[PDB]
Design an enzyme around this catalytic site. Sequence first.
Site, PDB file in Angstrom:
ATOM      1  N   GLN B   2       0.843  -1.209   0.000  1.00 57.10           N
ATOM      2  CA  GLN B   2       0.000   0.000   0.000  1.00 57.10           C
ATOM      3  C   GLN B   2       0.874   1.254   0.000  1.00 57.10           C
ATOM      4  O   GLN B   2       1.988   1.252   0.554  1.00 57.10           O
ATOM      5  CB  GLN B   2      -0.885  -0.067   1.243  1.00 57.10           C
ATOM      6  CG  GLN B   2      -1.745   1.180   1.541  1.00 57.10           C
ATOM      7  CD  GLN B   2      -2.641   0.839   2.711  1.00 57.10           C
ATOM      8  OE1 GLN B   2      -3.745   0.323   2.506  1.00 57.10           O
ATOM      9  NE2 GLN B   2      -2.095   0.965   3.936  1.00 57.10           N
ATOM     10  N   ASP B  32     -22.582  12.015  -4.757  1.00 62.76           N
ATOM     11  CA  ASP B  32     -21.666  12.133  -5.877  1.00 62.76           C
ATOM     12  C   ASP B  32     -22.158  11.275  -7.066  1.00 62.76           C
ATOM     13  O   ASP B  32     -23.366  11.021  -7.219  1.00 62.76           O
ATOM     14  CB  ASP B  32     -20.251  11.658  -5.430  1.00 62.76           C
ATOM     15  CG  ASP B  32     -19.105  12.438  -6.118  1.00 62.76           C
ATOM     16  OD1 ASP B  32     -18.973  12.292  -7.355  1.00 62.76           O
ATOM     17  OD2 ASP B  32     -18.300  13.189  -5.476  1.00 62.76           O
ATOM     18  N   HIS B  64     -15.538  10.009 -10.814  1.00 63.70           N
ATOM     19  CA  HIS B  64     -15.294  11.034  -9.804  1.00 63.70           C
ATOM     20  C   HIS B  64     -15.706  10.539  -8.397  1.00 63.70           C
ATOM     21  O   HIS B  64     -14.933  10.715  -7.444  1.00 63.70           O
ATOM     22  CB  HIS B  64     -16.073  12.317 -10.172  1.00 63.70           C
ATOM     23  CG  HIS B  64     -15.950  13.444  -9.197  1.00 63.70           C
ATOM     24  ND1 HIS B  64     -16.852  13.616  -8.162  1.00 63.70           N
ATOM     25  CD2 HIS B  64     -15.123  14.525  -9.164  1.00 63.70           C
ATOM     26  CE1 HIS B  64     -16.569  14.745  -7.531  1.00 63.70           C
ATOM     27  NE2 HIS B  64     -15.537  15.322  -8.123  1.00 63.70           N
ATOM     28  N   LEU B  75      -9.296   1.344   1.800  1.00 60.50           N
ATOM     29  CA  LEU B  75      -9.045   0.363   2.888  1.00 60.50           C
ATOM     30  C   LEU B  75      -7.577   0.312   3.319  1.00 60.50           C
ATOM     31  O   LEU B  75      -6.683   0.515   2.517  1.00 60.50           O
ATOM     32  CB  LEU B  75      -9.454  -1.050   2.456  1.00 60.50           C
ATOM     33  CG  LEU B  75     -10.958  -1.172   2.164  1.00 60.50           C
ATOM     34  CD1 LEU B  75     -11.197  -2.562   1.611  1.00 60.50           C
ATOM     35  CD2 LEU B  75     -11.785  -0.913   3.437  1.00 60.50           C
ATOM     36  N   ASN B 155     -14.032  25.512  -8.216  1.00 64.61           N
ATOM     37  CA  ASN B 155     -12.790  25.665  -8.960  1.00 64.61           C
ATOM     38  C   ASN B 155     -12.854  26.916  -9.862  1.00 64.61           C
ATOM     39  O   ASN B 155     -12.372  26.891 -11.010  1.00 64.61           O
ATOM     40  CB  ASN B 155     -12.507  24.451  -9.856  1.00 64.61           C
ATOM     41  CG  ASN B 155     -12.419  23.142  -9.080  1.00 64.61           C
ATOM     42  OD1 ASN B 155     -12.065  23.131  -7.889  1.00 64.61           O
ATOM     43  ND2 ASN B 155     -12.720  22.051  -9.742  1.00 64.61           N
ATOM     44  N   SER B 221     -12.826  19.225  -5.402  1.00 63.86           N
ATOM     45  CA  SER B 221     -13.432  17.896  -5.155  1.00 63.86           C
ATOM     46  C   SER B 221     -12.506  16.938  -4.371  1.00 63.86           C
ATOM     47  O   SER B 221     -12.991  16.069  -3.654  1.00 63.86           O
ATOM     48  CB  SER B 221     -13.737  17.146  -6.446  1.00 63.86           C
ATOM     49  OG  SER B 221     -14.932  17.601  -7.023  1.00 63.86           O
TER      50      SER B 221
HETATM   51 CA   LIG Z   1      -5.296   0.121   0.633  1.00 59.22          CA
END
Ligand SMILES: [Ca+2]
Lengths: 63, 281
Positions: B2, B32, B64, B75, B155, B221
């Site tokens: 990770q 969203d 998005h 995670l 933005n 965002s």
């Molecule tokens: Ca991960």
Amino acid sequence: KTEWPELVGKSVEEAKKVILQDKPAAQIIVLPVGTIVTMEYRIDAVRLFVDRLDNIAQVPRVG
Amino acid sequence: AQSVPYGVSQIKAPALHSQGYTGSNVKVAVIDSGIDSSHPDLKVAGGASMVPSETNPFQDNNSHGTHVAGTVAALNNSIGVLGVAPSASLYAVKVLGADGSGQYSWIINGIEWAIANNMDVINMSLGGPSGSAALKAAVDKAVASGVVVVAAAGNEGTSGSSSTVGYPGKYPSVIAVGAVDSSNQRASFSSVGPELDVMAPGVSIQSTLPGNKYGAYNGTSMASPHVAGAAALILSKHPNWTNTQVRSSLENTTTKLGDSFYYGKGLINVQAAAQHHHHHH
Ligand SMILES: [Ca+2]
Ligand code: NA
């Protein structure tokens, strides 16, 4: 050039043509004015907000 | 292996993770474009679609909502990225279609669904230049109901001395979040104005994309879910703090950057926010 205030009140068609002259690689998407939209910033994109007559209703800009 | 995207470290989320707080049992609605629930670095706990022609909130045809969701809650495991609040209960509240746009009534129906489903936090990485009485009423009702509501500032960049913050971020009940980069410089596209509340990283933000992908996106965002994620960390450490208290804790502990018109209160610092005593660093 990243904003086109002179396109407000023009047809969507003329806006696309003008923007593609200035930025030929632009990824153009047409959306209804008065909608809510994602707030990612895409330097390659121009969102065109049209009214119900298909005229530009907001200053087009990159993003 | 990770990777921890720079923005997660920048807001000091790893300090909370080291204390053992990761957003567990906090319900966060990503309002969203949907969330791709098949991504192996996300776990989606529920959701609902308000988009009449895209009825599956677990299908994200834009990309998005899935990116935003990964910043909130990717995670904690040995793959992909790590979210700010990696144990958060993540809800896909789809109110935007494939083209990234939604009608006001769709957004409002999603805010209503979040209130009715006891969401603790709403993230809205979305906006437009006009408000409506009914949009204002929806976000005010969510706040009155105890929900922390966070939105992208917009933005629109600068426009002389005018505010360029869009709605719903521009409403006082909503925390409006602008974007900085890894050096804490305001991104040039980041909206400005007295409604700008806090900043968070929103340049070259790596996160989850549909179809088991990752990628770097830019925008207010991307800044907003750092703050939604931070609210979930703070709530996992202080499950009785009200939305009021969570909002002040984040406001009151920012690292001050420049003038408040351009930077609001500065960069959030979730380590400082989640202490009992708050001050700026
Ligand atoms: Ca991960
Ligand atoms: Na606000």
